[PDB]
Amino acid sequence: FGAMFAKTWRVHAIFKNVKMKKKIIKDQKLLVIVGGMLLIDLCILICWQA
Amino acid sequence: TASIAQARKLVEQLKMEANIDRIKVSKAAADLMAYCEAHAKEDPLLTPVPASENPFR
Amino acid sequence: VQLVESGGGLVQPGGSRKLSCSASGFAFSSFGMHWVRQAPEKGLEWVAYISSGSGTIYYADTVKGRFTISRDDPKNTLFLQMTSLRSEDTAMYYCVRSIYYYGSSPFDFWGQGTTLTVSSDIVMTQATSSVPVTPGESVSISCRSSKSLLHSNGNTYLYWFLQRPGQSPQLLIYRMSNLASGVPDRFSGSGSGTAFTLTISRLEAEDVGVYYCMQHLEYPLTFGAGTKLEL
Amino acid sequence: CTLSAEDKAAVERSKMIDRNLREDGEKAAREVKLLLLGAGESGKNTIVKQMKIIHEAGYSEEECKQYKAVVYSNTIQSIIAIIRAMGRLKIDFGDSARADDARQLFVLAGAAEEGFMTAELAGVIKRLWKDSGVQACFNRSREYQLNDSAAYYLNDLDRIAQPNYIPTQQDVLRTRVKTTGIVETHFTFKDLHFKMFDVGAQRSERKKWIHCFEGVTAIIFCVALSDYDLVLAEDEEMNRMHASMKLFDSICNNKWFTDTSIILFLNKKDLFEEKIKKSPLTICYPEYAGSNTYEEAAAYIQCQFEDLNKRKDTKEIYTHFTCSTDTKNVQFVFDAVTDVIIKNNLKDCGLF
Amino acid sequence: SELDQLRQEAEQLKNQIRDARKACADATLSQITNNIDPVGRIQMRTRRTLRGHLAKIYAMHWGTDSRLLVSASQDGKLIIWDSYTTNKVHAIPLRSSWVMTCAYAPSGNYVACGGLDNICSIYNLKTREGNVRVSRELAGHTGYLSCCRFLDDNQIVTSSGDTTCALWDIETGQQTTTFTGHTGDVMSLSLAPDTRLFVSGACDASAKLWDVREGMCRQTFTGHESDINAICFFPNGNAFATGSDDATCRLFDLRADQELMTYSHDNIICGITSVSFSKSGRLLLAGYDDFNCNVWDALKADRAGVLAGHDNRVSCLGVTDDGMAVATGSWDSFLKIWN
């Protein structure tokens, strides 16, 4: 679900503002926030297991 | 006529260049080789240097 | 390039006051500022520093908690707000301009001085404090540090200043060998480690005054007492 | 942890410079860069004039602020120009007052700082202009390389001496009329900025200087459809249609611009349509083998230009048929380049 | 008849020059350097990457302290770099973003910037106010400025797309010498380690040796098949090398008055954008439009290495005064300091 939501969040950004046509960021920006969400659930789950 | 005046300037330039000192190319090559050898050790790009010497380490 | 500071006067112990400095003639917002205050019995003492940007501020430990420094670029005005003032705070306060980058001159322009009257690390040392000199003679003076002033980057951070009677200090020499703009080539210096010297080839009437040396290696900044090169 | 007190301050300076560059870059991004190429007297003005016909896109409010900045810059140039012009003469004149030299020093000191307009220095140019000696030396001074607009720098002292400026078009024309090199037109459309670079009389090598402009959003190319029956004046054996095609072929296939969009505007479509019924395209395209009907003549010419593209699978060519009485002519390019930019950024990410 | 007679004289003079040069070609370099030890495999690596430009880089120049660089890109700003700490010391806004060239004054007090506006702007960096301002606008050229180099304080030489070079007196703001005789637009300048002598190249497949004080061309060098893109001196000041759109770099010698060497390979079809020598003159560097820079053995014309890393066309190349490091730049908007 985080991959789905990032895939659609990119679309939100590009369409809303073209003031700047460029800086799409490609693939690299995305794997970052999905890893952020995996990191937060990983920390909550590891503190639970601890 | 401008074409004639311009042709005259060209001939005058050629007359100068046609009358200059020249040397054999074999000597010019020897002089360039000697320069490269004389300064061979002053060129860090051909002679590697240690990190303590390279300001960019 | 001019820096004038006004807003002094006499206060009672425990009170507060605000000093300001009006700048003109230079890119005010690109420069940092120091406050340095001079007590008649002590000489120059560093008070506070504000970065040319924001967010980086240092105070001398003797004023920390009582002094506040701020800058308002839209009005080319520097401020100093002081509270809980004590008799020890009585001094002539100068606004000092400084800019830092490779090859800069960190203490080039000094203001004229505002008097504050209150009713009622690395230590630099010097010898003699008063060498008699006659115009036309050479002069050699020196001072010492409690700490080595040589950084691993190859630079030494020792500055020499001259203050004449009735004038604010002016910079002569920074980083051992570099002269400030307008400084005659009569002045030079050298040294290593913790001991450094200043040389004058010929003592001219314009050279008579009190010489200071200070370090700018680490904070806080400090000054030597000053050597008076009078006849 | 290894830096000196000064080294750390130097790093803060560098970071603040990066901050200012980043802010500048964001501001920099909005304008669309358009490069205008093509044959002389080709109906290019119709494209430009139409953009200029409405005038909605006038000096912007923000642009007006820049103009206030432009006026300050030109006003400083004006006051130094007059005290400099009278101090570099081949023949000197006597001043009306010995005080004028002190005024010159004040102007030169203020101009050296080059900050903003000072009312006292604005007083100097007003007095120097009235002084008959300063005006009298003009006839000799003007022998040098002066700006043709230089008369405005001085003559406008009445208004540019006022601290609160009201900007006008002359305030930027002072430097625009120089017409040196490529000259761009700055305009806006629906809160987008544009700069269209008008290339004319370049000479030299047609394609050598330009390479530098790789990355331009689109190249604008114009052809006048109704002029298909005219022979090129420079070379009486060549029809103008073939000269435009040779330029298109040599520009659109330039290795410097491999996928750079091209927007082709075919002008005078109404005069064209009312002429092909009298003069078949065979006047300029003897190989033409169609009827005298718009859907065939207009499609043939469009096809002939499209067949000049050697990178059909990479560079998209846009075609629009224009006339002097329309509003789609200006809206087309507005939307077309916006779509090109979106197509480009989608290509960059690889989504497309 | 008068025009043809001058053509007849020109034809004989040109043949006499060619014959005089051919009579001096008593050996080829392939017969002379045959038994020199090779330079071997040279592997240069990036030590600094300088980031900040937002546009294609067009100009880059070393300062005389071997520490500072000035660069310019189409974003309309100059940056003064501290190469040791990747710090920005100055950022100078331009009134026109279309920049082609810049120069670092040998004294460090000024820099030059020029371009499509045909005006060379001289900036004062060593100011008291803290900002950087234009001291002079050297207007008077009728074409783009492809190159400018300082000779001394208040003395600069400029190229122009109007095919004429000029020597400017900056303090007075006037031209003192004009150098006419080029056929094509002037593409680049190079100064000898002697301010009285320099060479230039132009879009006419010919390089010319100019006398700064006399204003005369003393030698003309040919052999290129296409326009000259870059020129530089051999470190000894008695020779120079050029690059061109024909993807061949050529080495000329002033006193031999002829070409000595060519540098090419069957698998190179890419143009040359920049050339320089290393401090010893033994390594010849060249940047190409194929994104890479190569390393040539200046005495053998063998390949010694490749400097790969840029993702777009190489626009700038040069070596610091002490030969310690090489800086390059490209259309990808990064600068790299090698070794």
Side-chain angles (χ1 to χ4, degrees):
Chain A
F1 268 52
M4 211 173 291
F5 291 165
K7 176 162 72 174
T8 189
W9 164 95
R10 181 193 68 191
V11 177
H12 160 274
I14 303 180
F15 295 89
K16 154 196 211 171
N17 296 132
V18 55
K19 301 300 299 180
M20 181 180 181
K21 53 180 180 179
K22 296 183 178 181
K23 185 179 180 180
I24 303 301
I25 304 180
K26 220 179 180 180
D27 300 0
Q28 298 300 359
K29 191 63 177 181
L30 295 174
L31 300 177
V32 158
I33 74 155
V34 79
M37 290 173 306
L38 269 71
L39 172 147
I40 194 69
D41 86 351
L42 168 147
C43 74
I44 200 67
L45 193 43
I46 194 66
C47 70
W48 183 18
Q49 203 271 342
Chain B
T1 300
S3 295
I4 293 169
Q6 290 173 0
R8 178 66 181 273
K9 289 179 181 178
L10 176 61
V11 170
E12 291 296 321
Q13 180 67 23
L14 290 168
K15 287 194 289 186
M16 181 280 292
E17 292 189 15
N19 292 277
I20 64 170
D21 289 342
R22 295 181 172 84
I23 65 168
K24 291 180 176 177
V25 73
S26 67
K27 182 59 163 64
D31 288 348
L32 292 168
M33 291 172 71
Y35 179 98
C36 288
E37 290 177 354
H39 298 276
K41 302 297 187 181
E42 297 175 348
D43 185 341
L45 297 174
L46 180 59
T47 300
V49 301
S52 67
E53 182 173 358
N54 188 324
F56 299 97
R57 290 177 178 271
Chain C
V1 179
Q2 172 65 288
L3 291 90
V4 178
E5 61 291 345
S6 59
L10 182 145
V11 300
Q12 305 299 311
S16 65
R17 177 170 285 271
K18 183 185 289 185
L19 304 178
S20 65
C21 181
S22 172
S24 65
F26 60 97
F28 179 80
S29 66
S30 296
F31 289 87
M33 299 291 171
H34 298 260
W35 282 104
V36 180
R37 69 183 182 179
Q38 184 168 34
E41 73 277 17
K42 184 175 179 179
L44 299 171
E45 182 177 59
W46 176 81
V47 178
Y49 170 55
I50 184 165
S51 172
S52 65
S54 68
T56 298
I57 298 171
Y58 296 91
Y59 297 92
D61 58 303
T62 62
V63 302
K64 183 177 180 180
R66 299 184 301 118
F67 282 35
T68 299
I69 187 169
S70 67
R71 187 178 77 251
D72 185 49
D73 288 344
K75 296 188 286 293
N76 295 332
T77 300
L78 182 72
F79 306 88
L80 176 63
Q81 174 70 53
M82 309 165 282
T83 190
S84 298
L85 290 171
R86 298 180 66 86
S87 66
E88 296 83 0
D89 292 316
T90 299
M92 184 70 76
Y93 288 72
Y94 299 89
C95 180
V96 181
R97 194 181 80 163
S98 183
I99 187 163
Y100 303 90
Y101 56 85
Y102 170 69
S104 75
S105 179
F107 299 115
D108 50 358
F109 288 92
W110 293 54
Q112 292 79 48
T114 297
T115 299
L116 172 65
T117 300
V118 181
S119 69
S120 179
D121 296 338
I122 300 172
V123 178
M124 303 302 292
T125 67
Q126 63 186 53
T128 306
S129 305
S130 184
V131 177
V133 297
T134 300
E137 299 176 320
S138 66
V139 179
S140 178
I141 63 170
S142 67
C143 65
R144 295 178 184 271
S145 174
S146 68
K147 184 173 182 176
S148 172
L149 299 178
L150 173 65
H151 186 280
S152 67
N153 66 20
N155 295 314
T156 299
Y157 300 74
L158 179 67
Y159 293 70
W160 297 85
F161 296 78
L162 169 63
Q163 181 180 28
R164 303 183 186 86
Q167 296 182 2
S168 67
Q170 301 183 324
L171 177 68
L172 295 177
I173 301 167
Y174 56 97
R175 304 193 183 93
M176 291 179 70
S177 63
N178 297 323
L179 299 177
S181 297
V183 176
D185 60 0
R186 293 193 300 279
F187 294 94
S188 68
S190 183
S192 68
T194 58
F196 300 83
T197 67
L198 181 144
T199 302
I200 303 169
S201 65
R202 295 289 186 276
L203 197 285
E204 300 296 339
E206 295 79 4
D207 301 329
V208 176
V210 180
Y211 290 71
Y212 299 77
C213 71
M214 60 85 76
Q215 65 87 19
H216 196 349
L217 180 62
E218 67 187 45
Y219 285 94
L221 303 178
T222 63
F223 297 92
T227 302
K228 184 177 181 180
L229 278 293
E230 183 57 278
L231 176 64
Chain D
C1 68
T2 60
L3 300 176
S4 69
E6 296 178 356
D7 292 333
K8 290 179 180 178
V11 171
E12 289 184 354
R13 179 184 172 86
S14 182
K15 288 180 179 178
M16 288 189 285
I17 292 168
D18 284 345
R19 180 187 60 78
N20 285 338
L21 291 169
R22 185 178 183 323
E23 181 178 1
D24 289 345
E26 303 301 2
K27 188 294 181 179
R30 303 66 176 269
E31 293 177 350
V32 180
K33 294 180 177 66
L34 303 172
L35 177 65
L36 176 62
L37 307 176
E41 296 300 359
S42 60
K44 61 177 59 181
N45 283 334
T46 301
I47 303 301
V48 174
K49 184 176 180 180
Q50 185 169 16
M51 290 189 289
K52 294 181 177 179
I53 303 180
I54 312 180
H55 189 262
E56 183 178 2
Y59 51 89
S60 299
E61 297 62 7
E62 184 62 1
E63 283 300 1
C64 183
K65 299 181 180 180
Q66 186 60 0
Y67 296 138
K68 292 186 301 180
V70 171
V71 173
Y72 283 119
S73 180
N74 288 336
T75 301
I76 292 166
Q77 292 298 308
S78 180
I79 61 175
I80 198 168
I82 198 167
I83 66 98
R84 182 178 64 199
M86 71 181 287
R88 295 292 181 271
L89 301 170
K90 66 182 183 181
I91 295 168
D92 291 317
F93 292 71
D95 293 339
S96 69
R98 68 183 183 274
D100 287 345
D101 287 345
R103 289 180 183 276
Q104 290 175 61
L105 291 171
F106 286 122
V107 168
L108 185 60
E113 290 184 352
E114 203 178 359
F116 63 94
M117 185 279 285
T118 297
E120 293 80 1
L121 273 57
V124 172
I125 193 169
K126 185 182 289 185
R127 177 62 178 166
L128 290 174
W129 181 87
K130 290 179 180 179
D131 186 326
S132 65
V134 174
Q135 185 62 51
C137 73
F138 179 77
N139 289 339
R140 278 73 178 272
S141 181
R142 68 184 181 179
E143 293 179 354
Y144 181 74
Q145 298 293 303
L146 276 70
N147 187 346
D148 289 345
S149 64
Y152 292 98
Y153 286 70
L154 271 60
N155 287 339
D156 290 335
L157 69 92
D158 287 344
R159 63 181 280 272
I160 65 170
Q162 180 172 286
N164 185 16
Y165 290 150
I166 300 168
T168 188
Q169 293 177 335
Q170 186 65 51
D171 291 324
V172 63
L173 292 173
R174 287 177 181 174
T175 62
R176 290 174 65 193
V177 298
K178 290 180 180 179
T179 319
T180 297
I182 303 301
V183 179
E184 79 279 15
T185 299
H186 185 194
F187 62 90
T188 64
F189 190 121
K190 188 176 179 180
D191 184 1
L192 280 69
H193 285 250
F194 303 76
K195 294 182 181 180
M196 183 179 289
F197 296 161
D198 187 7
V199 179
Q202 70 285 0
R203 295 181 177 270
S204 301
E205 301 300 1
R206 306 176 183 178
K207 64 179 180 180
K208 299 296 183 181
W209 63 271
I210 182 180
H211 61 258
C212 71
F213 298 91
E214 178 183 359
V216 67
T217 297
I219 297 169
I220 307 303
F221 198 91
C222 296
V223 178
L225 290 170
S226 68
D227 294 316
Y228 74 104
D229 62 337
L230 301 177
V231 176
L232 186 68
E234 293 77 3
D235 183 336
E236 69 272 23
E237 295 182 2
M238 181 180 289
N239 189 284
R240 286 178 61 84
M241 293 303 290
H242 290 289
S244 294
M245 290 175 72
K246 288 181 182 295
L247 291 171
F248 184 97
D249 188 66
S250 68
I251 296 167
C252 70
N253 296 302
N254 192 31
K255 69 183 182 182
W256 285 103
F257 299 78
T258 59
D259 62 0
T260 302
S261 73
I262 298 170
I263 304 172
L264 175 65
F265 292 93
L266 303 173
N267 296 307
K268 308 180 190 176
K269 71 185 180 182
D270 52 352
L271 293 169
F272 175 75
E273 186 174 2
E274 295 296 323
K275 288 179 73 170
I276 61 171
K277 70 183 183 182
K278 296 188 288 186
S279 178
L281 291 176
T282 57
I283 195 166
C284 61
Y285 297 117
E287 65 273 19
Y288 180 58
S291 72
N292 294 329
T293 191
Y294 185 86
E295 60 272 17
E296 293 183 43
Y300 177 80
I301 292 168
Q302 178 180 336
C303 291
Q304 289 296 308
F305 285 120
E306 289 172 350
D307 285 339
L308 299 175
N309 186 5
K310 271 69 169 175
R311 294 180 171 86
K312 286 183 174 180
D313 63 4
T314 301
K315 183 184 291 189
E316 182 176 358
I317 310 299
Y318 297 84
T319 300
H320 179 46
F321 291 84
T322 64
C323 64
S324 67
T325 58
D326 197 344
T327 61
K328 294 295 184 181
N329 296 345
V330 73
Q331 290 177 0
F332 177 82
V333 72
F334 173 79
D335 290 343
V337 306
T338 299
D339 288 345
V340 167
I341 293 165
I342 294 169
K343 288 178 180 178
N344 289 339
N345 71 23
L346 291 172
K347 183 177 179 180
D348 288 344
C349 183
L351 299 180
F352 181 91
Chain E
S1 294
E2 297 80 1
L3 183 60
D4 192 68
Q5 289 171 338
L6 291 168
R7 183 188 65 81
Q8 292 172 32
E9 291 177 354
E11 179 65 21
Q12 293 299 307
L13 292 169
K14 288 179 180 179
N15 286 280
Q16 289 169 355
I17 292 165
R18 284 193 290 271
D19 288 344
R21 289 177 167 172
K22 288 189 289 186
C24 298
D26 63 332
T28 64
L29 269 293
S30 66
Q31 298 165 315
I32 298 167
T33 61
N34 53 9
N35 292 304
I36 198 166
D37 287 346
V39 298
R41 185 174 67 191
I42 300 170
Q43 292 295 307
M44 297 182 181
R45 296 289 183 270
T46 300
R47 300 299 190 187
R48 298 290 189 278
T49 299
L50 304 175
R51 300 178 176 85
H53 278 302
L54 302 176
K56 279 71 177 178
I57 294 164
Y58 297 147
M60 180 277 285
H61 189 220
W62 283 98
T64 55
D65 68 355
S66 301
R67 179 171 178 170
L68 298 177
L69 292 89
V70 58
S71 65
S73 74
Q74 190 171 338
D75 60 18
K77 296 179 177 65
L78 312 174
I79 300 170
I80 305 300
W81 305 88
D82 182 345
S83 67
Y84 293 151
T85 59
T86 68
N87 294 149
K88 295 183 178 67
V89 180
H90 295 285
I92 303 167
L94 305 176
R95 292 171 179 163
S96 178
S97 67
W98 294 356
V99 57
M100 295 179 72
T101 185
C102 66
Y104 194 92
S107 70
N109 292 281
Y110 300 78
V111 301
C113 181
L116 271 62
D117 293 316
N118 316 344
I119 301 168
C120 180
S121 295
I122 308 301
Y123 293 76
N124 186 338
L125 273 62
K126 183 69 176 179
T127 67
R128 68 186 179 182
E129 298 81 4
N131 60 19
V132 178
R133 305 187 298 279
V134 175
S135 66
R136 295 289 186 276
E137 295 181 355
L138 304 174
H141 283 291
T142 58
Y144 54 85
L145 304 178
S146 70
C147 185
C148 64
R149 293 288 185 273
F150 286 96
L151 272 63
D152 204 334
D153 281 344
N154 295 311
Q155 184 178 67
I156 188 165
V157 61
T158 61
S159 69
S160 181
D162 65 29
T163 78
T164 299
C165 297
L167 179 66
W168 291 80
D169 177 327
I170 293 170
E171 183 177 359
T172 303
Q174 299 292 308
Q175 296 179 74
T176 62
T177 303
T178 58
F179 304 75
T180 62
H182 278 291
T183 299
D185 297 3
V186 178
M187 289 294 99
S188 65
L189 305 172
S190 177
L191 301 177
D194 185 321
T195 56
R196 296 170 294 174
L197 185 142
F198 73 110
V199 294
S200 62
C203 297
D204 52 23
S206 181
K208 287 187 176 282
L209 175 66
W210 294 100
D211 181 319
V212 170
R213 290 180 179 176
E214 294 295 313
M216 67 180 287
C217 179
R218 290 186 179 279
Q219 293 178 271
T220 301
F221 294 89
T222 66
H224 287 285
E225 295 179 22
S226 191
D227 292 343
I228 297 169
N229 295 332
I231 187 161
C232 65
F233 277 98
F234 188 80
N236 197 37
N238 65 342
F240 67 93
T242 55
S244 74
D245 283 333
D246 65 13
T248 298
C249 184
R250 301 173 188 272
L251 176 67
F252 297 89
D253 184 84
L254 269 60
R255 294 179 298 161
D257 195 46
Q258 63 191 265
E259 184 180 58
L260 270 63
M261 297 182 72
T262 62
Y263 303 73
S264 68
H265 190 280
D266 291 346
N267 292 331
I268 299 170
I269 61 168
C270 60
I272 299 162
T273 64
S274 65
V275 296
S276 69
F277 288 92
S278 73
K279 185 70 170 183
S280 63
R282 182 62 193 269
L283 301 178
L284 173 66
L285 304 176
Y288 297 80
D289 67 27
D290 64 9
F291 305 175
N292 294 322
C293 302
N294 291 329
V295 183
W296 291 98
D297 185 335
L299 299 177
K300 297 191 84 175
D302 289 336
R303 294 178 64 84
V306 61
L307 278 68
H310 282 295
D311 291 325
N312 209 330
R313 298 179 180 85
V314 176
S315 63
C316 306
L317 183 147
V319 62
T320 186
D321 285 346
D322 65 2
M324 185 59 76
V326 177
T328 63
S330 74
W331 290 42
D332 65 23
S333 301
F334 295 74
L335 299 171
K336 295 182 183 296
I337 308 300
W338 300 74
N339 292 359

